[PDB]
A paper describes a structure:
Diabodies are among the smallest of these bispecific antibodies. They are constructed by connecting heavy-chain variable fragments (VH) and light-chain variable fragments (VL) with short “GGGGS” peptide linkers. In order to investigate the structural flexibility of the Fv interfaces of diabodies, we have determined the crystal structures of 10 mono- and bi-specific diabodies with and without bound antigens.
Although changing Arg83 to a threonine substantially reduces ambiguity in predicting diabody structures, they remain significantly diverse, which limits their use in designing protein nano-assemblies. In order to reduce this structural flexibility and prevent chain shuffling, we introduced disulfide bridges between the VH1 and VH2 chains in the Fv interface. The sites of the proposed cysteines were designed initially using the “Disulfide by Design” program, with the crystal structure of diabody 6052 as template. In order to examine the structural flexibility of the disulfide-bridged diabodies, we determined the structures of three of them. All were designed by the “Disulfide by Design” program using the crystal structure of the 6052 diabody as template. The three diabodies have practically identical structures regardless of large variations in the crystallization conditions. Some of them were crystallized in a buffer containing a high concentration of salt and organic solvent while others were generated in a buffer containing polyethyleneglycol. The pH of the crystallization solution ranged from 3.5 to 8.5. This demonstrates that the introduction of a disulfide bridge can essentially freeze the structure of a diabody under a wide range of experimental conditions.
Author numbering:
A (entry chain H): 2 to 124, 201 to 308
B (entry chain G): 2 to 123, 201 to 307
The structure:
Amino acid sequence: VQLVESGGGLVQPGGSLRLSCAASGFTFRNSAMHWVRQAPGKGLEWVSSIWYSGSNTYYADSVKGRFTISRDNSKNTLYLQMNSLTACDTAVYYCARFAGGWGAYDVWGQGTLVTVSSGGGGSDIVLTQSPATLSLSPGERATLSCRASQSVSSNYLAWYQQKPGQAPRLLIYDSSSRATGVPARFSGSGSGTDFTLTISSLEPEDFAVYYCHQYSDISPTFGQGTKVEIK
Amino acid sequence: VQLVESGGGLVQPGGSLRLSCAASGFTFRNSAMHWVRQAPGKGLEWVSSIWYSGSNTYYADSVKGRFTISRDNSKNTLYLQMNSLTACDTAVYYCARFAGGWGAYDVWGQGTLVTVSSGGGGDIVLTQSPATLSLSPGERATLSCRASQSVSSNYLAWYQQKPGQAPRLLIYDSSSRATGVPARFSGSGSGTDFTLTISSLEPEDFAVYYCHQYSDISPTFGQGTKVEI
């Protein structure tokens, strides 16, 4: 009693793959068959199901409208056609027989890794911001930090303010240049991998989420933000 | 000097939307124009860029091959064609002028929310606890799975997953111990509250354990409990 899985691999975004699952040791034509996936370091996630007949296909929202489940009962084979692949599809995909009240997922394929990426073997510049949250009162000085995983060419680092429900607003660019109209209490500094945004004296309108942003290469990245809230 | 955005909204998985961004107050035809997005509760993420004829358009892997950035310079308008949309595209999308060393993103559109979902206004959420268990051999492990709604027919299963292997069925129908599973594993519970007990732990029991409800047409899993020896 087994499910012999095949397919998968590393594919460019937008691409297509077909997974296969050849069944033996049970009455395939009498069995509902499902796909389940598991993103790296994450939990099991249902993907798709098909009735013994080939009718009544169902799909999780993560794949609906892009993936197609099908079966060939005369070949005891289940398929998952994956189209328009995107980075968030990256995961180990398992086929499974669904026995319902007579066994849940009682037969599993061994799984195959699908990775959707156009990336080289290197890594992007990761920006870490500290602290995650600042509880301050108006009048106090706030010092925000942005730490880059590697050096930032030309000091191409910018800071943005974002209030709830509003677009980001440029504060500082080139690590230290104040954007037009920005009050003088906003000052940025640093070079290389360590950068700092300073608000000399907080006003009530300064409470917001602040983002750092590096634009030194073709893969611009952002920090995850620092929230300045009233204490 | 402004960017006036349009489009967005709620769309079914696999569908398509076009966003647009109409610029005024600067020589748009020569500008480098980007799209940037923000998932709900998350941070900013660059999406796509386009600049003069003679340079490449660029896309992040999150959208490459599905989305198309374009411009109609005679209309001073930037576009984002979003095809085969998926749940992980849900986000507020901003257009922005990129000025590089002269200002990074110095002009932003006001943003528009794109939500990709087939759901109604209500899914059974399974919450496992503890997240982590550290025990020694011979001890007994008690694992818990709480459901946000009653699990019809007690159609609840438990799986064992060892590192790098496929899940293994332990328990189904809340208490049925699967063929070949040792009697020290036992499932109990009913309705919204289920328990997995593991007696006389072995080193081989080191694994992650997931619960699973299959009481409806939208099966869901718990996030798992890791038990180490």
